[PDB]
Structure 1
């Protein structure tokens, strides 16, 4: 760790040190003491089938033995993958990358080049690349990117001179943005006649066998986390003209057969919609059980989202700190301060286990914070962590300014 220059997002203890897990299977991880934990983090939501899913593993092992193509060259598995992507997501053309970061940078640069226009309006996280960094919201960074924090009043201001705007790129959230938000988003962008890049790295295939909302009409999409059960594959597709500059993309590992095996195998399953409905059902039991447990002990922690993708909304940082300590004590591995994303290995027995552990958390919290209330502050702070901008709750510009001051 001393040696590592980077700071990977991962589970960390109270001291900030990465939590070590030495094996895992399905929904369960094992720590170096042999204790078993239930994983709701699941490699930031990229393990959707379950750790060690055997169908994926068999495919990867066959590919590792050279039976399913070579890294040197095109293979039939690639044809199958590209075909599957276009059937499920749509679009004229498709492309592949190793990370969501890479996919988002490449498509944003390509669409900007095709549009010959300098400004990109953005909300949501799009990866680690410095092109997205900015010192303040609502004004262009040095790369021409304007963060609008899912504020449609700001978006409307920017779209009021739409000829300088190349694209609008958003990472759709469905915990804190509803049908009204999407209807207005799409109204605005269609009025401006500016293309939409839907960054569905997290939500594409998450809820259903396809992109997350028919309320967006994207010119370009990206999916990744739900594509390959954690193997490093991201895909993009959409309009051929907008993605013309993708002709310049090539990378050494393009034909690597294990990644292709993982993606073809996982996509075949996700395209049925079965895993997503299993996960929704099981997650929904856990959320219903947890919401009740907490309500009845007077613990000031609510939940947002659904079985596929949910989050805890704590009254304050003190509640949250105590909640995380108690959860870790019961071996519940949540993505702290962010979204929870069960896999298809979160089955009914695991739900029963997890519900026991959350009874024990609720007991560990009872009587301590009863005098505390979930306020609008709690909600905005929680949403900010999980979806990387402002919740769709009614507000004036003065309020928007005050919330940003608190959370930036």
Structure 2
């Protein structure tokens, strides 16, 4: 009753936040002592695992003042900035406390440097009201045009390239492939319009770097993979587009526990070793689950890979039944959105999770055999998880019909 905000979090079927009292690695414990396997992982920001020991020891030393103070530049900051530039590229780098703050700051800075008013956007960029819009494909009151990853609309807006400050996208790799990224980059290069790659979710997710070499971002942002859940985001890119960042400073800039979390995690994510382990383990879970449902006649498929995947259900009634059965087995999925295992999702947790999925599959068998995964199923599922239109062959008239069906 006291909270004015509505934070995104796991909720029961009555909409009440699920409470978890502790976590370790891949397991959460609820107030009754029941253990759940976490695939949500603070919306994909816990990539090493809850309570990771190396990060925990670094945070504890930082909390005791051993690794610098919030008052001043610390011996480890240069190494953080240098590694961010080595891994992600760019002339210059910047730090923020949320993805939302980073996205607003760089978008305003790029727009100011470009002295142009229109920003073409796809994907979620945070909670700030500058991104709110009543309708797609037209400018909101902040000059932002949502284009739902539709390249026909993008091409039309880029046909008047001089009024476009930038194109900002949150890259998705479950439903957008090589053809989409090749054409996206072709259009933006042709228009000579800088690209802001919002990689808050996919930067460092798949490898020690940004998510695809088919993008040539003028500015990038990463965050969820950077600090095992501690509140750090980073940006980098062309110096002149980020000139306005000279005005950015905030009180907790040098706070040592955030710095310990980001440096310790980035050093490990820069080895590529966590992403390779998660990919293998998550891929085994996906393969098992896809086969389990298909053999049981359960109309649920999967998209994505071990690092980041989603469930595709025939309809919302199947999805509701799936989520209720998953919760009953102690599987904690980010409902309707993307599942992101951490490095604590090891071979033994995979076996546990596969066993829980066997019980989920048994619980759904015979209930929805008549339902089919349709083109509509895939569009609706993708929309819920990557905030726009899947790259599936479609006509322009179908684009309109899908958007009218799925908007709001």
TM-score bracket for this pair, using the shorter chain length: over 0.9
Distance in 1, matches of 2:263 and 2:383, equals 34
Residue 394 of structure 1: CA displacement? 1.1
Distance in 1, matches of 2:105 and 2:306, equals 32
Residue 398 of structure 1: CA displacement? 1.2
The corresponding residue for 2:71 is 72
Residue 76 of structure 1: CA displacement? 1.1
**For 2:240, what is the secondary structure of its paired residue?**
coil
Deviations 1:57-77 (A, max 9, x none): 000000000000000010111
Distance in 2, matches of 1:41 and 1:182, equals 27
- 1:227 aligned onto 2:238: no
Residue 395 of structure 1: CA displacement? 1.2
Structure 1 segments of 4+ aligned residues over 6 angstroms from their partners: none
Distance in 2, matches of 1:16 and 1:165, equals 41
Residue 110 of structure 1: CA displacement? 0.1
**For 2:239, what is the secondary structure of its paired residue?**
coil
* Larger CA deviation: 26-35 vs 80-89: 80-89
**For 2:125, what is the secondary structure of its paired residue?**
coil
Distance in 2, matches of 1:396 and 1:136, equals 20
Deviations 1:259-298 (A, max 9, x none): 0000000000000000000000000000000001000110
Distance in 2, matches of 1:367 and 1:118, equals 55
**For 2:259, what is the secondary structure of its paired residue?**
helix
Residue 202 of structure 1: CA displacement? 0.1
The corresponding residue for 2:285 is 286
Distance in 1, matches of 2:75 and 2:106, equals 25
**For 1:235, what is the secondary structure of its paired residue?**
strand
TM-score by length of 1: 1.00
The corresponding residue for 1:187 is 186
Q: What are the residue-to-residue correspondences of 1:7-406 with 2, within 5 Å?
A: 7-406=6-405
Distance in 1, matches of 2:396 and 2:296, equals 37
Deviations 1:302-336 (A, max 9, x none): 00000000000000000000000000000000000
Q: Unpaired runs of 5+ in structure 2?
A: none
**For 1:197, what is the secondary structure of its paired residue?**
strand
Deviations 1:374-401 (A, max 9, x none): 0111101110011000000111121111
Distance in 1, matches of 2:43 and 2:259, equals 20
Distance in 1, matches of 2:358 and 2:206, equals 27
Deviations 1:343-371 (A, max 9, x none): 00000000000000000000000000000
Residue 337 of structure 1: CA displacement? 0.2
Distance in 2, matches of 1:113 and 1:179, equals 32
Residue 24 of structure 1: CA displacement? 0.3
Distance in 1, matches of 2:216 and 2:287, equals 33
Deviations 1:76-122 (A, max 9, x none): 11111111111111110000000000000000000000000000000
Distance in 2, matches of 1:117 and 1:396, equals 31
Residue 216 of structure 1: CA displacement? 0.3
Deviations 1:37-58 (A, max 9, x none): 0000000000000000000000
Residue 136 of structure 1: CA displacement? 0.2
Distance in 2, matches of 1:282 and 1:172, equals 23
**For 2:196, what is the secondary structure of its paired residue?**
strand
Deviations 1:223-261 (A, max 9, x none): 000000000000000000000000000000000000000
Distance in 1, matches of 2:284 and 2:7, equals 31
Q: How many pairs does the alignment contain?
A: 407
Residue 154 of structure 1: CA displacement? 0.1
Distance in 2, matches of 1:158 and 1:396, equals 18
**For 2:370, what is the secondary structure of its paired residue?**
coil
